[PDB]
Every structure is written in C-alpha cells, then in structure tokens.
Nucleic acid binder design. Structure first.
Ligand SMILES: [Mn+2]
Ligand SMILES: [Mn+2]
Ligand SMILES: [Mn+2]
Ligand SMILES: [Mn+2]
Ligand SMILES: [Mn+2]
Lengths: 437, 437
RNA sequence: AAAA
C-alpha cells in the first residue's frame, strides 16, 4: 500500500528520460511526467509528445500521471502549477530525476518536492543522468550506477521517442543490389573488397570521377533514353584522344576491368575492353536494364556495402543485433514531413552513431555532408549522438574538416569524426575503435 | 563593505551569461564565475575558455572570481569545491543567475548559496534568462524584465565569446564588386534589381542555368584561357540543334539583354545582340578582363548584393549600425582552424541571424546549404541563433526543406527559415518580418 | 539559455 513515485522532467531530449525510466521502472509504483504546455505567446512549445512516447515505450499505462506546466521559464508559475496539479497522495518515497527540462524547472521542481515531502516517513531522492560518463548519479550519495552497458535501445524505439515513424532499413541478407545483380553480387563485392584491401581505393575513385562519371553522368535522365546517351557519347568522341571514351578503353587498370567484368553479362558497361556504345534500335528500357543499376552501384553505393560488410563482422563478435542495433540505408520521417536517408546506423548501448559515407575527395562536398550527418543524428537520436563521416579525402583534409565542424558540448570525446581514404582498407577496425571506447 | 556579488554558472553557451552580465554589471561589486575543469577520465571538458571571455568582454578585471569545479555531475564534489573556493568575505547581497551549466551544477550551487546566505537575512536572489521570450526571471522578487531590446551585442564580441577570431566582413560602401565595376556597378545592380522586383527572378535563374552556365562554366579557368574557351565554344557550335549559343542569341529575354547591356562595354558578355566570341587576336588577359568578373557576378554573387541592398535601409531605420549589427560576407576562424564564410549576418538585440544565399533551385544543393547555415550560426552565436536560407526553389520545395531540417528545442518560433524564388521581389520585408516580428 |  506504500506508494513510491518516480518523477521525470520532460524536456526536448526524451532519450535520458527513457534510460532513467528503463533502469528504475521496476522499483516504482507511480510515475509523474512533468511536461510543458504549448503557449505561442511566450514562444513555448509543448513536450507532451515526448511525454506520450515515454509512457508508450516504457509501458507505464495507468501508473503514469501527466503534469503540465504553463510556463517552464517562470519560477512563480512553475511552483503554482505544482501545488495545484502534483498528485496529493501518501507516498513513502519520492524520487525526482532532474535531468531534463529547463533550469528553472529543475530547481523549482526539486525544491517544491523536497519541501512537500520533508516528513521523514517520506524519503526524497534526487538523481541525474550524466551524459559524459553514462552514469546515474544520486544526490548526496557516492553511488555511481553506470548505465552505459546495462540499458539498451533499438533503432525503432530510439527514433519513435524522437517522434520519427515509418522506419525502414536493409540487412546484410536483404541488401537491394543483391537482387539486382543475381549470382554475381558476391563476385562484384569480393572484387571490390579485394581492391580496397589492396590500397587501390584512391585509384578507383580517380577512375570513377574520370572517365566513369564523365561518360555515365552528364544529364538528368541520360541513361534513361538511348538517344540522349548516344548524343552524349558522340559529343565525347569529338574530344578525340583526350576523350573520356579513349581513357576508358585504353587507360583503365586491370583491377577495374576485373570489377566491370564481374557484373552479369546483361548488366555490363563494356563490350570486351571497349565501352558498350548503344546502337540505334536499342530500347530505352533495354539501355536502363543494362546500365542503370550498374552505374548507380559503381557511383558510390558500392562503398556503402563495403563499409557495412567490414562493420558487420566485428559487430556480431560483440552483442549487437542487426536490425535493432545496426543496419544500412536507414530512412524515416516525422509525420507529414520529408524522409531522410542515413547510410549506416550503429547503436552502442543507448548512443546512436550515424555514419555518412562518400567516395568524394573534395573539401566542399565532404564539408556539406559533414553538416548533414551532424544535424541528422541529433534529430533522430538526440543531442548526445555521435556522427561519423567517411570520405575519400587524405589525412590532412579529414583533420581540417574535423576541426572546421567541431562543436563544443562539454565533453572531451568528439561527437563528429571524419575518416579518409587511408582508413578504407581497415575501416572495420577504425569504426570499432572509435565507437566502442 | 556593503558588497553585492553576482554569481554566474559558465556552461558551453556564454551568450546568456554575457547578457545577464551586461544587464546587472553596474550593480554588483564582485563576480563569481563558476566553471568546469577538464578531466578526460570522466569525459568532461572545461568551460574556462568561456569564463575568460566573459571576464574580458564584460570588463570585470579584479572584481572577477574564477571558481573551478572538478566534477560537474557529482553533487558531493560540487559542494566541496563551493565550500573551499567561494569567497569568504561578508556580502550584503548574493545574486545567482543559474541559467548556465549542467543540471547538477544548477541544483547544488543554488541550494548551497541559498543555505549560506539566505539563512543570514542577507539578500539572496536567483534569476534565470528565458531563451524563448527574452526575459530575466527573478525567483524572490517575482519580476520578469524583458532584455530583448535593452541588451545589445556586436558581431566581434559575439564571435569572440564563442572563441572565434580574425573577424572580417564587407560594408555597403566597401563591397568587393563595386571595385570590379567602378562607374558601372550601380547601373548593373539597379537593372538586376528592377527585374527581380518585377517577378523575373524565376525566368532569370532558368536562363542562368541554360544557356549561361552551359557557355561560361566548365573546366577550371575556362574564361581565362582563350584556347580553353574557343575550343569549348566550337564544341557547342557542333551541337547546333540544341546549342546554348543559339539559345543565347535568339531565346534570351529582353530584360536579360538590358542586364547584359548594363555592364561596361569592355566587360559585356554580348557583342551587340549576340554572344561575343573571342577572336585569335584576343589574349588570355583580354578574355579574363572582359568576362571573368562579369560571369562570376551573374553566376550568383549578384544575389548576395541584391538581398543585402533590400534590407540595409530598413536595418538603419531600426538604429542598427552596419559592421556591428549587420554586414555581408562574414569570415572568421577558431585558433589554428579553417575559416567559414557567411553570406549575410544580422543581430536583433542579442540573437544572431545568419542568412545563407543561393540562386539554386535544386533540392539537394539547397538542403546541403541548409545544414550548413544551421551549424554555422550555432558555432558562432550559440544554441539560440536563427538560420535563414534563401533559395531559388518554388514554394513547395521551400516548405518541404523547412520541415525536413526543423529541430525541436522548445520554442514555437522556427529558428531555421527557408525563403524561395517567390520571395525575392519582397525579400526585404520577408526578412524584416521574420527577424523583427 | 529545455542529458552544460
Ligand atoms: Mn546515402
Ligand atoms: Mn553517402
Ligand atoms: Mn584580420
Ligand atoms: Mn557563398
Ligand atoms: Mn551563398
């Protein structure tokens, strides 16, 4: 009959409240979720949506009481709303975790509760989830409960509490290009993996920019219409010896011919050691069926698979579960809002690690992709997520970019990490060292 | 004697401490800056850099007391540090603004100071700077003074307290392209301005894609090497069916001819009513003297000047001073770090408004520039800065991009705003309404 | 300045 209540403060970061809730839920009879009301006149949005998500993914059910605060910036109104709305019941223990919310929410929820339950029959406890060392810290108690490895969360819960829905991703066994290149994907990927393991990555991306991209990427729907692709071919042919066609035919290294000749016969860009030039009477659907998937894969997607295959090995040696804690081609939306696409996600405990991939060696483009991955991981995983960008740049540029985009949040470990071309051969070990540390 | 001390908690956002420090400085004799020490074992960085900037730009001098904390997540270590390091002098008033720092800093600094001084009939007060409605909220006096229009800050001190240095920007009177087109820039910009205010912006940017960019953009230094340009032009001529040269001569709207003819004769892209083709007598220097500056301005730099010219008069009416509170092409670095450039900066009170500009109508490029301006205003202005991205996209893409990149921080006012092609003619009022209302 |  002795009721114990846990109190959480619902800010705009639901993850710490999920973690503290997951750890302490079994020891408490009631839960008071203190959230903000929506008042446009004071520029105050509501965190009720996060409070609902916390109730849903913690299975609080009837034990949950929602307490709205009219003004989360004004002490006088916080205290008034607390006296009016805080549950007036016989509690034998009141535990406030003051991790979330505004500063004035924290001090005045703390002191209101410590005063209302000063009777020694009622034990008051205050706790705080330290984001830097992953520890639940109790007030006036040396107790330091590390929750880094004990509390776990899957990608679906993590995105759901951050208000994202329609979560889709691919597995090692459901990778899309495995279907598009039947009976050959392993041969293609092994040939590509062998080349990257042989320090041929820079040679590969150089050939991909010139002459690959100058031939197969020049217009919006170039590879969708045989006439436009043939027109693009004739224009290049006019550049004579210096044409990309000649460099493709005459200056393509053997390891790149082997990669091209691993694709299925009906989906090869080459006829022997010569660029397949479509003739007239080639249907647009015949051209697309032969070059669309092959060009799109050779145009960057191969690197998403390569890095994913290097990570999956070492992640399975650990406790990670594919689909719940890592995956490829993550996509989701907020309601009535555009979708995003994240290359690779990894969850180490309850920390999201989003990984953005590119073969580009250009500072400007890699920089923009650096901004992109930083904003995405905070949208879907909260403000303590880590962003990793894997580029084709050399060591000097990756260190430059890392310092360029570094933002200070009070921790000593970087939340934005950049890898470059020299890390491709052992990219699995590099990620494992950076993530699990 | 009769000493009144103000206490500030130094987190990773120095701006609220600067605003509270500027507002209350004249009324307090001593200032206690409570900051964190660096300890990589507990993944805790130090905010001493911000504390030093706060002492410098508030001109506290020997009235400033630095109070270091060893562990900002540990209730006990916080109190031990407070007992041993807080000034032992007799104070008649102790005012603590608890806006910054961790939640455990806020709780245990508040309750420590409250017991030490409010128990002695000494004036103890606590305040909190509301980020959403720009109000300094007092706990005991129950006051909430709006500092929105009373506290000011300049781009130099704003960037400095956020640890940025080497701050450069251009004035209206020092705009770079005013030197490239002396005696002609006004005519050039006024002709472009008249067209954009006539809703010709969409037609202009489509012409800039084709055939302008098809003709004057290609290999690096295309417009500075006559052989590169003339060979490139001969290739376009062989595509006489869909030649950009034919489209230039025959399909160019009259308002663009007026723009092209607004340039000085030696810097026109047109020879009369057709494209100027360099003869073999034209040297590399003549070609660059005629075309290089004109093309770069028409390629998008004109839009930077246009937007800046549409707001400058309205900013001066609001008593904002150029250079301090607004400017164009802001550049700065962190120590030994790459520079950034921001097209336009604006400061309303103490909120930074960073404005990124592009004539592009493509989703992906505008999206990548959206991530960029969001991060940059965060780095140089703190977590409450506003980011505006002005694009050449239609209204549907503009609304999509806002929702795509929106991030929840607790306010009802959007801090990422996107404008599109349909906003160009009235961009001065659109910005003025978004920023100051 | 709503896990500093
Ligand atoms: Mn991708
Ligand atoms: Mn990618
Ligand atoms: Mn300088
Ligand atoms: Mn620019
Ligand atoms: Mn720009």
């Amino acid at each position: 009959m002795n009721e114990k209540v846990l109190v959480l403060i619902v800010g705009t970061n639901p993850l710490p409240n999920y973690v503290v809730g997951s750890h302490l839920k079994e020891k408490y009879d009631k839960f008071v979720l203190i959230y903000s009301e929506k008042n446009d006149k004071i520029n105050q949005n509501s965190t009720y949506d996060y409070a609902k998500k916390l109730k849903e993914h913690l299975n609080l059910n009837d034990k949950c009481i929602f307490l709205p605060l009219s003004d989360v910036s004004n002490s006088e109104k916080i205290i008034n709303d607390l006296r009016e709305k805080f549950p007036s019941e016989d509690f034998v223990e009141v535990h406030l975790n003051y991790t979330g919310g505004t500063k004035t929410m924290v001090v005045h929820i703390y002191n209101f509760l410590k005063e209302k339950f000063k009777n020694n029959k009622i034990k008051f406890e205050g706790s705080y989830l330290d984001a830097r060392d992953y520890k639940l810290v109790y007030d006036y108690s040396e107790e330091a409960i590390s929750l880094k490895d004990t509390i776990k969360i899957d990608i679906n819960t993590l995105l759901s509490i951050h208000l994202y829905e329609d979560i889709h991703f691919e597995f090692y066994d459901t990778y899309s290009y495995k279907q598009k290149f039947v009976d050959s994907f392993d041969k293609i990927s092994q040939e590509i993996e062998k080349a990257i393991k042989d320090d041929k990555g820079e040679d590969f991306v150089k050939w991909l920019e010139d002459p690959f991209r100058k031939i197969f990427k020049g217009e919006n729907k170039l590879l969708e219409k045989t006439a436009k692709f043939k027109k693009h071919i004739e224009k290049l042919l006019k550049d004579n010896d210096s044409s990309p066609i000649v460099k493709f035919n005459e200056k393509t290294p053997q390891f790149i011919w082997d990669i091209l000749n691993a694709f299925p016969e009906g989906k090869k860009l080459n006829d022997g050691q010569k660029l397949w030039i479509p003739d007239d009477k080639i249907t647009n659907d015949n051209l697309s069926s032969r070059v669309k998937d092959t060009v799109e894969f050779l145009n960057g997607k191969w690197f998403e698979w390569y890095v994913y295959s290097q990570i999956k090995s070492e992640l399975l040696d650990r406790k990670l579960k594919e689909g719940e804690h890592f995956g490829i081609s993550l996509k989701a939306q907020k309601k009535d809002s555009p979708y995003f696409e994240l290359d690779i996600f990894l969850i180490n405990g309850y920390q999201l690690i989003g990984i953005s991939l590119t073969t580009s060696s250009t500072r400007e483009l890699c920089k923009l992709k650096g901004f992109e991955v930083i904003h995405r991981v905070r949208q879907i995983g909260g403000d303590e997520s880590k962003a990793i960008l894997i580029t084709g740049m050399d060591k000097s540029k990756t260190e430059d970019l890392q310092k360029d985009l570094a933002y200070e949040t009070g921790s000593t470990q970087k939340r934005f990490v950049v890898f470059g071309i020299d890390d491709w051969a052992d990219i699995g070990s590099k990620i494992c060292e950076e993530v699990f540390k």
